[PDB]
Amino acid sequence: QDWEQYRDRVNMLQQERIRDSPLLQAAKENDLRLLKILLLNQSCDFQQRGAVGETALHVAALYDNLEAATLLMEAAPELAKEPALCEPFVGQTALHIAVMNQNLNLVRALLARGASVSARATGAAFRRSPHNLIYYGEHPLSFAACVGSEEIVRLLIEHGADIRAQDSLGNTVLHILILQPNKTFACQMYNLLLSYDEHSDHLQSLELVPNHQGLTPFKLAGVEGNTVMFQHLMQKRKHVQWTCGPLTSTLYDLTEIDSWGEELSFLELVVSSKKREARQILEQTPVKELVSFKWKKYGRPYFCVLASLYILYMICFTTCCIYRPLKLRDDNRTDPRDITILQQKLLQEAYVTHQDNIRLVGELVTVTGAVIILLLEIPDIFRVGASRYFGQTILGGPFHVIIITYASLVLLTMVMRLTNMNGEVVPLSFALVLGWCSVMYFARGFQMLGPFTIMIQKMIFGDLMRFCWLMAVVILGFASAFHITFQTEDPNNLGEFSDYPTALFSTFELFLTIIDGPANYSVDLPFMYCITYAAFAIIATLLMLNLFIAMMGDTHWRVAQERDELWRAQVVATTVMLERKMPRFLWPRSGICGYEYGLGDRWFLRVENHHD
Template identity: 30%
Template sequence: MDSNLSLSRPESDGEDSSEFTRERVFKAASQGNKSELIGLLDFLLANHKQLTSSDFIDETNGKTALLKALLNIKDGKNEAVEVLLDIADKTGDLKELINSSYTDPCYKGQTALHIAIERRSFEYVKLLVQKGADVQAKANGSFFQHGSKRGFYFGELPLSLAACTNQLETVCFLMENPHRNADVTDRDSQGNTVLHTLVIIADSKAENTEMAAKIYDEILIRHFKLQKHTGVQLELIENHQGLTPLKLAAKLGKIGNRPEMLRIEPLRSLLRDKWERFASKLFLMSFVMYLIYLAIFTTVAFYRKEGEPPFPVENTPADCLRCVGEIISVLGAVRFLYKAITIFWKNPPQKMALFTDGFSEILFFLQAALLLLSAVLYFCGQKEYVGLLVLSLALAWMNVLYFTRGSRQLGMYNVMMQRMILSDLLHFLCVYSVLLFGFSAAVVTLLDDSSKVKNVTLAGGGRAEAESSKCDKPSYHDIRFTTLELFKFTIGMGDLQFTNHVQYKEVFYILLISYITLTYILMLNMLIALMGNTVQKISDQSETIWNLRRAITILDMERSVPKWLRSTLHSRASEIVCFGTNQDKCRRFVR
């Protein structure tokens, strides 16, 4: 603060100049005009007021003059800040002023320290902490909540805010200042520590990930130096979802180097040992059991009864076996549905998860849901149950591809196929659907209504069977039939038999040539080219993703084993791994 500035106001001729209102103080604070604050101290002392009195706080949001001044820092400076702090010190409400926060639901809990960090003013951060700022104050308004579309989530704490905005100097100061050190183990309203928050704000950008990893490591190192006597392991702290920072990173799939962790020791050898010791046997057993289930399901569907369901169980060996097979099929669907819902509850489907393991879980969920819906329709006496039954059967056979992750070559092939379905083929189908429907509607509109086949009354009042069969034949006036015929043109099986029924053949030929050019020539060849490019681009990634899928499978197999049996599956073998040339930095890893 400028020591040449007197906080006491000299004698003034006008009464208005000696009257300080909230608007006047806020205006001076926002403009950084310390000369307008001359006499404020005398006014407060004379009227027994403070800067935290209700007269100088915005009743709508709890904003104080200090918050107003910090929000209007220009070129890293606002001279009104020092003046306000000095006045509050002399009126006895310094800590109250510094730790006053917003009270409105949107910015609730935001203090002067939060704003100083947000404005990247390291000097004011040091000044506020020196004056008694609460380094554990939590800004828990709706604007700062995770998932807010218009807000910014940073973990509520000042330390988390500094970490998420890449202010390493401020992070180090908050952890090691001589006044009050920030508690790194403190958690926000969602149970997230500063490490959880860094994982959440990290994305696939290399620069962002590098920044988050750098601050993440720095916090770990400094916490170990400062709090090693406490024995608290920062990376083992769980949030309200029961996730450590590493588990959260695995769930969100945001950290780019997470798949590469499977290539380093001792993790790779540990996973290989588990796969060879018990996971491969359990996986093979699951595959055989699924094939048996699939054989039963297929047999039941193939030898289903004809007629109005539900069918009574007859006292014959064949019918009893059919009934047992139906029960096994439904119970298997219940198990698949329960497992899928459990996985979705713990890890809701996300776009990134589809490229790792979520694709298979969704197919198993659809298979089970369709079969159970088919069972409901069956008992309700609806013949439509057959449609859902065959769809579930088709998905059941598709889900055999899930077990390709047990083989390296087949697993990598399955990874490439799923990546192309989720990217190239999905984009192709979106564009192709628009073109197919648009040209089908145009062709149907162009057909001549007088060309519709009509019944011809024969002599004697009878009707010819040939004419009746023509009436039952699908017409090109039906947009569904026309859409199917145009689809045949896309795959080179089109039929031009309906060209005689169009009103304007020239316009029809223009539509047909345009459709074939856009779909059969352009889009199909573009799809083939894109798929080839995708294969080349992800050939290196496919093995990594396959390793990741197999690692997930190993962990799922291990969790499915009863606790009393897990100890017998672990070899308990140990291996000493040294880091660098220093023999003192050796660790023993137990399998």
């Protein structure tokens, strides 16, 4: 069964036992007079529970019923301390339910009895999933903070609610408020929980308490794509120096963005986030002024020096494919089967020559230039995880599938040599169509060439191959029908259709008008040919091509703001990708340090404004 149909059984079987039991019936309906009388004559033993396993007070708190709920707590002393027992609802007590409803007087009544403010709700319907519409955490302080009810929030802290508790995923009360869809109404709540902070607990500040996967609530505001909470967490870390007219020289702290850490870099997590909204943190005023300083000062010359050691490499690999050891044809086997054109095979002559030694040192450059590419890509596979890394389209994208299968086919051609294999022309032709089309990677600078090469990528996955599933059928339709008409005829006159793997290939060419329409006006073609071909020229090359241009012409202004918003996030992905690699010799640390103009040990970045 699906889980969606499993919980629909439980939420409806609960509604049966409320109808069956007379005590639970009056709780929902606020029948006070029954609940006074039915609790006199042996007030019912409260293991009498629903199929979920809840007491009468959980039913009385699930509905807005003050007066019936208080009469149950007077007769029964301990209903505030009982959990539910069904597996998607484990531990949800009456205090978890009264807080959710924002019921002001019922929470006051429950806390007067001493209900535990540290009860976990560990059910399978409270954890975060794409098929649960709420994620409010486990502790009841977290329930009050997410519903925007500030009066219950300050009421629980006065009774012992600890703002430093964590749920099973590790999220504290601050991690959850960033994960809420109501973005602009949690900033009022985040100011409140900092005033209740102990300021005694050394655990360093609550803003720096880590998740299980390592994210602090500052660092989680970036990954989530929360542009409102990012500015709020930055008001603590800027200093205003002077205001001279319209100018204002404010001074940002730059420590939780200038992370000098082994793998938890803030600028890595923002660009490699799967959330679409994370590409807008990169335009906020302490960050946009930073990654346009790394790029224009250092990241642009090191990416133009290194994009011409890769043109001078691929121009050293084609001139060692052209010059390759072809002897003369030492055989007369081309005279049988006059259909064959073939001539001179191969050699083993890198040694005995005057111009295969200049060719030799042009090969060992290409041999030890395809092992360096394997040493800079393979240990970068495991860090991201081999399935995110080949598909992000920003963090490299599908230019790491090409750049490895280029460097793998240079090493095969070495093993095709030194053992005297024959088909050396098969990897050399796959290397040169992939090796040059990887030089197209280095248009990630060059604002001119930049956003164009995304559109090639976006029209080869989205809009070309949905045109090609419905044309592997039309060129199987007509191509297997031209083979039938010319199966009778002679192949010496109009012999484009002589064998069935070329019946498909001549018809795929006729689709593109590359080959002309096959006609011979000195002979009688069969009459069935000119009917099937007058239908092929309307479906294939009026309609199906001129509608593919139109499909290309309207999905290009839909992606108008979206490829240009994606290019500026592809310069930031290049700058952090280089800062892992190049050694510390190159790249002094960004920002003016502060131990000589002595305030501390932090590394600052100065940005001045103009009030328009």
